[PDB]
């Protein structure tokens, strides 16, 4: 009523089920009695051919198929090169504690990198800003999105659920920076004129063949899977239902089931995951001096984190345990198994 | 938006040949004569650029108002108290109001005098024109770093001007005609059209009509008088005067960095865009 | 009112602004002879500006062609673009010259033909009562356009001395040195004349233009006939804010202005990227202008030859980036936010530098209102380079006793050689000075 | 942002690459010429990471193309895909180059073009302000690719120090010594600055290539039009998750991060199935992923002659597994379930193993939208059998006298040849010993 009133839902200005709706209201009133089944298979009328004709309101209006796959895209990161050279200028110039100017700066930066990489849609780089908290230590993992929306796609997307979307997207550029920064101390170390033949650097190299291989493999089958047969469910039931809400609930099943598999325990393992991606920071900043390897500094540095990696593989060793002796849940057990014949074998 | 906003600059280059007839105030006649000759070259100066037909020439008229120049006496300016007045005709009521008239009179007596300033920044070089005029092209008493500092006085003017007109002219055309007509709203357009004014005001400066802004854009104008009576005219009186320019150019980049709260004012970071120049040099 | 004459002159210099008068028919909507579109007044809202304004609208050029070589002159009569052109303002039919290859013979040609030098060519000047100023279109190549284009740089000075000087000089070839062997000597004496006798110049090198003939243009054999393309239409780009309606540096003295830094240092570097016509079936996707810039201060448009190495110590100081035709000016001010976090100028550390952009509507045609435009002036202080290899080209050439006794016999009696190399190496020490 | 510049060099470094780019104008749907199809954009997300970014639409190759034989170029521009290429970027016409079969001649010819090879192969490194590295697509066989591809491997090891260095270079033949015999002194010189002046190599046997090229390819006379088909599309394979939109190891700093344990231990083994145009007419009853992978470890894909039974005492360290197109990734992670059940790659008993799959979309074309393809990069200690097989042909070649006196008379006054010769066994033995 508000928009437009040839927009209804019923079909009150627009349509004729106004007419078929007083005959079946005519009929429900010559009842002095009442009981369940007469009135509920009627609210079926009141409800189904109201349930589809909206359904076939906002799929012309909008290409429904269009922005349900670029919000998607924007949070879960199906455009995972395009968000990393974001991730690597706002690196730079994010070390600070945050302050309130940094939510403008990060923002103008995140267009010229959407910029120069020559998205296929202008207009689709400023339909969003980015948001950022006070000033705990960093700004990194205290950053966020707004990606707002236009009419009647935001019954499908309350303010509620997009700080959802929002939260796990923090953390998934969190996984796109600590595997970048581990694949740029890694790549440090790839001649031998930066090579130091110790033993001391031997002991640096069997750690990062353990930790490197840890988020190129847990945040990939983590990640992948998470995409792939949970978008294709939602494929195959728009393409094949015409009713409203039972596809408005089963994206609310979508959604719930991605913050599921990426939160894996409340305590422990969010705890183990990023005591990981903090050890293995370290190990980027042990690196990143000038000839590592030989320095006194270079392996006494390195000694307290040659405990805290298997102060993590251990703490891995301690969740397979409650994984193997299980009543807890199907999809936390598949997954970290999943990761661990691919660690184990 | 060609005898308001000046994007068919014919018009305001001929309004610098009016700039060109004044030069200082007041010096100028208290005569009843003094708008009957003065209404008449602006419209002689429309036809002095060979632009537009006599149809739209009787909606732009000149009301010369009368304000105190000498201070005591009255012998008013062309610099800032010479106003263009746009007419209210027959069927075109709903488009203009009087308060849309009243910042029209704001907007044109604002670029008067900002184009004052890069005229007679030009007139300059027009004083030390080769034949040679001034010489020493090194030396004798300085002209090699006289004219450096004068150079990057007339280069950050020249740079803020234009960057001052790109901000007001440029998206305020492109949101206006197009998005109005094509919203098939068009019903009671003074309520559409004050608000495009409005907008073109705070792309301005807008200062709120209020802010120290304003004070600084008169303190810089306060030295181009003085820039340019030592060059029709002293070099050392020169090196002071220039320094308190790089002073006041100083003391407005500070300000900016005081109105600087976040997302906003898209003049704060093209001020910014400077401010980050300033800092890899 | 804004009225600027042409002064085309040498054997390089008239063909080059020949095809100049040839493109601005093309864009103004009007033909040479006649007016047979409509397009020419609600297209385009200023066309008096280069032209002589109509008595019968007739647009005359403001033109003069003075050339010892007569060759240059027939080659234009033939063409349908002549009768624009006026018997009267210039030459009639069959005029000639000297024999002629040499400096000293323009030099001295120009105190015997003195009194009609100055008679015909100061008719169009008082035709407006503001005129704007001259512009020299000559060559630096040969003894023709050198020998007495010095002449014309002394005598206007004085004369006409409230008016803008300012030229389109075209820099001789420097590839090999057997058909032409005076190169070292009238080149540097007419470039002292550039900087004390004249204001500014616009510097277009010859060695340059092949690296961009051979770069997108596709040819085998180069030859004379694409000398005119490259410089004709960055010609008529320099005045699309003087020739079409625009609002700021709209005058020849507005954009001179806002880019020299001081005097004897106005070399102002070119650019220009489109030229090819196979872009033409991509831009229907809306090509922005976020991408046009990038690769201006990148150095692949560029018409100078420099040093690659020795842009780190050097510094730019005015930069000019002129968008033409479809802009989409909401983005323009998105271009100009890239350049901070890139900074591929390097900055001067003594004062402000500035990245001037400007726009204005191009011609109504096909080809015009589609295709983004990009023409740069620049002005880097990498110029030296140019100055260092023109010295040592000509200090080496005078320990071979070469051209001392075969130029001093008609009208010079003492060594004016160190005159020109002392005021050059001053040229050169206050361009590194420049930035403290 | 990711732009990798291509080294081709030498006879069959040059072929390798050649149609290389040849075929990325076939899945990136454009022409060498042109953009007649729009399949460019909506059906491929990212085009510039191999390519120079577009000026008109035109994705200039990154590539250098250098070898002492003209031969190679000139069956290169009579080919209608050579006008992508340019005639600036590398050489114009007739380039040319030595006599020549030498190492030390390529060896001693890099510092006499030590300023025309460091000029223009550095102008496409500034294009882009954060470069990804260099593969240097050079050849082992001959003295042409070996003798001058060890030179830049030591000079742009500290000129470009922050920058990837992995290289697809291609194993010699050795079936007889007749027509070469300088084979083992070439290769083992270059196999020195592979590992110490080189992070990483992808190995391509020879002897391996006429296995595969008679097993389901049916030829009778072994020709060199066939090394340039197995080659091409396992190069084009190698860049699928970095030419096509991908998310994990999108980046050649990606994958090989991820499978080099330690330095001088880089050597990749190589699988690639699909190679069979009768296979097509029945994958359209969707032949799955579960079947693709349990023959990728079991040794028929390979292209590395190793022992049949060195691989009880060896151990698979780092498999990759890559599925391209159509994967139907419901069962992908049921692909990788059955992995742990066979045990058909050793692990080590050190530390952990790693079996990383990833997926990518490949071009919208009908025989790349419909059949599975499986691109397998391995690493398996069985790889010191070539350096065994390298090592017993290079001891038992000195013995028997065989130029020691024809290839010390250039630039070589030192016994170099146990310098090879122990850090070849310095490979061999910390190999073994890595697994403890």
Same mark, same amino acid.
């Given at each position: 009523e508000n928009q437009n009133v040839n927009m209804s839902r019923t079909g009150s200005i627009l349509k004729n089920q106004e007419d078929t709706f007083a005959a079946e209201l005519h009929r429900l009133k010559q009842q002095p009695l009442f009981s369940l089944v007469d009135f509920e298979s009627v609210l079926d009328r009141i409800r189904s051919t109201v349930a589809e004709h909206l359904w076939k309101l906002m799929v012309e209006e909008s290409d429904l198929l269009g922005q349900l796959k670029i919000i998607k895209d924007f949070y879960l990161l199906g455009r995972g090169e395009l968000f990393q050279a974001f991730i690597d200028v706002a690196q730079n110039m994010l #070390? $600070? &504690? &945050? $302050? %309130?100017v940094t939510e403008h700066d990060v923002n103008v930066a995140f267009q010229l990198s959407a910029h120069k990489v020559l998205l296929d849609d202008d207009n689709l780089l400023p339909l969003l800003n980015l948001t950022i908290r006070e000033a705990p230590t960093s700004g990194w993992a205290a950053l966020g999105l707004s990606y707002k929306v236009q009419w009647p796609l935001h019954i499908l997307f309350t303010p509620a659920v997009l700080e959802k979307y929002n939260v796990v997207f923090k953390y998934l550029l969190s996984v796109r920076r600590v595997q970048s920064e581990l694949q740029h101390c890694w790549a440090l170390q790839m001649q031998r004129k930066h090579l130091e033949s110790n033993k001391t650097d031997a002991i640096k190299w069997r750690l990062q063949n353990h930790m490197a291989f840890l988020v190129d493999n847990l945040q990939y089958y983590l990640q992948v899977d998470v995409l792939e047969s949970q978008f294709s469910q939602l494929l195959q039931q728009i393409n094949s239902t015409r009713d409203f809400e039972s596809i408005r609930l089963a994206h609310d099943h979508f959604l719930s089931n991605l913050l599921a598999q990426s939160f894996i325990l409340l305590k422990p393992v969010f705890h183990c995951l990023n005591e990981i991606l903090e050890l293995c920071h370290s190990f980027c900043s042990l690196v990143s001096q000038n000839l590592g390897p030989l320095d006194e500094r270079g392996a006494g540095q390195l000694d307290i984190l040659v405990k805290g990696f298997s102060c993590q593989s251990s703490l891995l060793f301690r969740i397979l345990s409650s994984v193997r002796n299980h009543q807890i849940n199907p999809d936390l057990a598949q997954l970290l198994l999943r990761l661990d014949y691919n660690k184990y074998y | 938006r060609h005898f308001l906003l000046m994007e068919d600059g014919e018009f305001a280059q001929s309004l610098s040949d009016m700039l060109f007839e004044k030069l200082g105030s007041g010096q100028t006649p208290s005569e009843l004569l003094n708008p009957l000759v003065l209404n008449s070259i602006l419209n002689k100066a429309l036809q002095y650029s060979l632009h537009g037909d006599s149809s739209l020439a009787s909606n732009l008229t000149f009301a010369l108002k009368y304000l105190p120049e000498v201070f005591t006496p009255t012998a008013p300016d062309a610099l800032s108290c010479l106003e263009l007045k746009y007419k209210v005709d027959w069927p075109l009521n709903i488009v203009i109001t009087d308060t849309c008239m009243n910042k029209y009179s704001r907007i044109f007596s604002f670029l008067l005098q900002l184009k004052h300033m890069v005229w007679t920044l030009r007139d300059v070089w027009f004083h030390l024109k080769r034949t040679a005029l001034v010489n020493q092209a090194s030396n004798s008493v300085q002209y090699r770093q006289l004219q450096l500092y004068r150079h990057e006085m007339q280069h950050f003017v020249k740079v803020i001007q234009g960057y001052i007109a790109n901000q007001i002219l440029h998206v305020t055309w492109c949101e206006f005609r197009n998005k109005l007509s094509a919203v098939s709203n068009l019903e009671e357009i003074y309520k559409t059209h004050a608000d495009y004014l409005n907008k073109a005001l705070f792309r301005g400066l807008? $200062?709120? #009509? %209020? %802010?120290p802004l304003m004070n600084i854009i008169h303190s810089i104008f306060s030295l181009i008088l003085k820039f340019r009576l030592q060059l029709i005219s002293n070099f050392g009186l020169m090196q002071q005067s220039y320094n308190t320019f790089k002073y006041y150019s100083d003391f407005l980049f500070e300000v900016v960095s005081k109105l600087v709260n976040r997302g906003y004012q898209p003049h704060l970071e093209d001020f910014l865009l400077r401010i980050n120049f300033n800092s890899y040099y | 009112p804004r009225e600027i004459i042409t002064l085309q002159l040498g054997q390089c210099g008239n063909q080059i602004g020949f095809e100049f008068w040839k493109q601005l028919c093309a864009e103004h909507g009007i033909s040479p002879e006649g007016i047979v579109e409509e397009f020419a007044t609600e297209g385009t809202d200023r066309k008096d500006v280069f032209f002589y304004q109509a008595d019968d609208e007739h647009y005359i050029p403001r033109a003069v062609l003075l050339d010892l070589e007569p060759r240059v002159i027939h080659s234009i009569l033939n063409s349908p673009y002549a009768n624009l052109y006026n018997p009267e303002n210039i030459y009639l039919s069959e005029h000639g010259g000297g024999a002629g290859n040499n400096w000293a013979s323009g030099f001295s040609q120009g105190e015997k033909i003195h009194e009609d030098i100055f008679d015909i060519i100061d008719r169009e000047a008082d035709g407006s009562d503001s005129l704007e100023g001259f512009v020299l279109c000559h060559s630096i190549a040969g003894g023709t356009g050198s020998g007495l284009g010095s002449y014309l740089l002394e005598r206007l000075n004085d004369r006409y001395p409230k008016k803008l000087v300012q030229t389109y000089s075209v820099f001789p070839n420097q590839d090999e040195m057997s058909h032409v062997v005076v190169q070292p000597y009238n080149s540097l004496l007419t470039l002292k004349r550039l900087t004390q006798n004249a204001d500014c110049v616009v510097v277009l090198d010859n060695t340059a233009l092949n690296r961009i003939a051979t770069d997108r243009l596709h040819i085998q054999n180069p030859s004379f006939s694409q000398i005119n393309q490259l410089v004709s239409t960055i010609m008529s780009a320099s005045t699309t804010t003087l020739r079409y309606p625009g609002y700021m540096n709209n005058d020849l003295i507005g954009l001179i202005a806002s880019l020299i830094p001081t005097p004897r240092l106005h070399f102002l570097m070119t650019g220009y990227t489109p030229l090819t016509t196979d872009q033409s079936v991509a831009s229907v996707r809306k090509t922005t202008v976020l991408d046009v810039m990038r690769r201006l201060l990148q150095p692949k448009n560029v018409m100078v030859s420099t040093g690659r190495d020795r842009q780190t110590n050097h510094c730019y100081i005015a930069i000019l980036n002129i968008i033409q035709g479809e802009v989409d000016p909401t983005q323009v001010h998105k271009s100009l936010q890239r350049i901070r976090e890139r900074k591929l100028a390097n900055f001067i550390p003594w004062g402000p530098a500035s990245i001037q952009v400007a726009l204005s509507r191009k011609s109504p045609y096909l080809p015009s209102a589609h295709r983004v435009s990009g023409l740069m002036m620049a002005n880097h202080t990498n110029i030296s380079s140019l100055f260092e290899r023109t010295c040592r080209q000509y200090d080496k050439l005078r320990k071979r006793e070469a051209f001392l006794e075969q130029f001093r016999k008609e009208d010079i009696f003492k060594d004016n050689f160190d005159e020109l190399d002392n005021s050059r190496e001053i040229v050169q020490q206050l361009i590194d000075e420049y930035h403290a």
């Open positions: #070390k $600070t &504690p &945050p $302050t %309130a | 807008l $200062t709120e #009509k %209020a %802010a | -």
